[PDB]
Design an enzyme around this catalytic site. Sequence first.
Site, short mmCIF file in Angstrom:
data_model
loop_
_atom_site.label_atom_id
_atom_site.label_comp_id
_atom_site.label_asym_id
_atom_site.label_seq_id
_atom_site.Cartn_x
_atom_site.Cartn_y
_atom_site.Cartn_z
CG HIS A 41 -0.50 0.10 2.49
ND1 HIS A 41 0.20 1.36 2.93
CD2 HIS A 41 -0.67 -0.62 3.64
CE1 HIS A 41 0.61 1.15 4.25
NE2 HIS A 41 -0.11 -0.04 4.73
N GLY A 143 2.80 5.89 10.30
CA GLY A 143 4.33 5.82 9.85
C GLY A 143 5.07 4.51 10.25
CB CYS A 145 2.89 0.96 7.18
SG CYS A 145 0.92 1.35 8.01
#
Lengths: 301, 306
Positions: A41, A143, A145
């Site tokens: 993503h 942030g 991820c």
Amino acid sequence: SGFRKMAFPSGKVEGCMVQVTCGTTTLNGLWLDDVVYCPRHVICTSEDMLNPNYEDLLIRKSNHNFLVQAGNVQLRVIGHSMQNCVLKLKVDTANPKTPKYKFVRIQPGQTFSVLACYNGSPSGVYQCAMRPNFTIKGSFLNGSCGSVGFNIDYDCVSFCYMHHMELPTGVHAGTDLEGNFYGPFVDRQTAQAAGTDTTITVNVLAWLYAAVINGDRWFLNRFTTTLNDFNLVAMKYNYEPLTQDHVDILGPLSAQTGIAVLDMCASLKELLQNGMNGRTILGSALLEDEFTPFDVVRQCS
Amino acid sequence: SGFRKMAFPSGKVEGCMVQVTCGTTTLNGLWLDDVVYCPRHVICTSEDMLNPNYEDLLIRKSNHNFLVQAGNVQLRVIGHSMQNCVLKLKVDTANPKTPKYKFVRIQPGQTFSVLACYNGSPSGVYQCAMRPNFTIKGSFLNGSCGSVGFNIDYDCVSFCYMHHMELPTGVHAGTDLEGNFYGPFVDRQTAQAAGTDTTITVNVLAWLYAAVINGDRWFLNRFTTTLNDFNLVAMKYNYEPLTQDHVDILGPLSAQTGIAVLDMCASLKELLQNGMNGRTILGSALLEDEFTPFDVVRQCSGVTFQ
Ligand SMILES: O=C1CCC(=O)N1c1cc(Cl)cc(Cl)c1
Ligand SMILES: [Cl-]
Ligand SMILES: [Cl-]
Ligand code: NA
């Protein structure tokens, strides 16, 4: 003696964490040999969040649209591909810090350490468990991820989790390192809700065995139970069913303490009925379910 | 979202851990620049440990009596001396992995990360508080002596603890890196007990703020209190006194959540006097006191250590 929620030492993973930027999005990547792994993503725009077509978004990208920074160094991206929900960026440098490693998909109840990271830099390490509903109860900010979960066996790092998103209840969902989500979740912002979560029975029993090993017996009783009667009671308290696999798994701790597995089950049944009556077990006033049988043997020896 | 007991990333310290053997004893050492630090009790036999004379025991030792292994490489010891309860083994090679570091002594109530080690090899990391009674509620088995505790500030590792011994209640005692014990303990095989412990009030308040930041608000109430009135309640419940510096330190969280410290003190007063009534806060049924105000800010802000 003592008993603590303890994570694996994080250094072997720290040396693999990088920053991946695509567009205005920055998150973390895991650099192993010449590949950087990160959530796919990262290629979504703000228009792409509900029904992204990742194949269509990725075919539009060039290698040079991915900025990968390892420390203060930019790595050169020379290739890219998608595997399920992870992106694999081929880079022109093998990571000299790559540990011995493997990718393992874990089952609910398993525990692992998380190295929370922001902008490719590690922030903290903590211990988590894959809940029965395939979420984890993490600590993650925007942030984070691409932060990963792992165990270490000997000197081999077993990567089991990559962080993708936070569900509305505040719990967290992600994938293995082949990009397959744990549980029924998808990398889309469409409404998704975790199943009701249950307590990991086999881990509570493990932890009660830890308590006995560390010298505490107050919660034992003179009774036993059949496996089926235990499950009938424990499910009324939202406990996962205990299987014969779990009974077998608890064999070693049973042997070490001299308390039969179904005798300990009877103790658990009574604790669910009585509460702790102002007492604590291993410093907790609740029953702890994020220590596996393997964790207990590793920490108590 | 979420709130977890969180250790610092331990890599910078892992690169410093070595194995130290003297006679039949193996434990851990900390290798920084060209010196390996470890507990001076490594030189004792079990007879020695009953009433050791450490200067006398050390005179007998040659440098070659200290076997130091970093990974599978031996380090050559070229000098040895004691500072308080730590042995300093001068070696012939500077540690190429030495991080930027300082030795700091912490105060009770302050937290740090422990890197538990066995035979020179890191096995686990966890977060601890220095208790008011100067013990730590650690998790250590035989062979863990010499494991260290630390914080990280920017890129600087502040070493604050070296593990020495376990007390009869199963809690743990050790020194700073200059070999000064935390607490009224001695490195001798005897009779020693931890004093009665108390709860770290400022940290409980910090954790209540963390709970509020994370949406857990049921304990909030319309009341406030005074320092003197609250401190009387604290004393009654074996809580440390809350000082004005504590209040100032929590100021940021008070401004961010809308709950003044004494407003939260009134929440804590009511929790102490009435309990949680079947509820939990951040998943705990006990009031957690091993997060400092700084810990809560750091974790609820995402500070990093590349
Ligand atoms: O060796 C030590 C150092 C710390 C301490 O308190 N001890 C200890 C503990 C027990 Cl349970 C029994 C005995 Cl003889 C000694
Ligand atoms: Cl598993
Ligand atoms: Cl608890
Ligand atoms: Na109030």
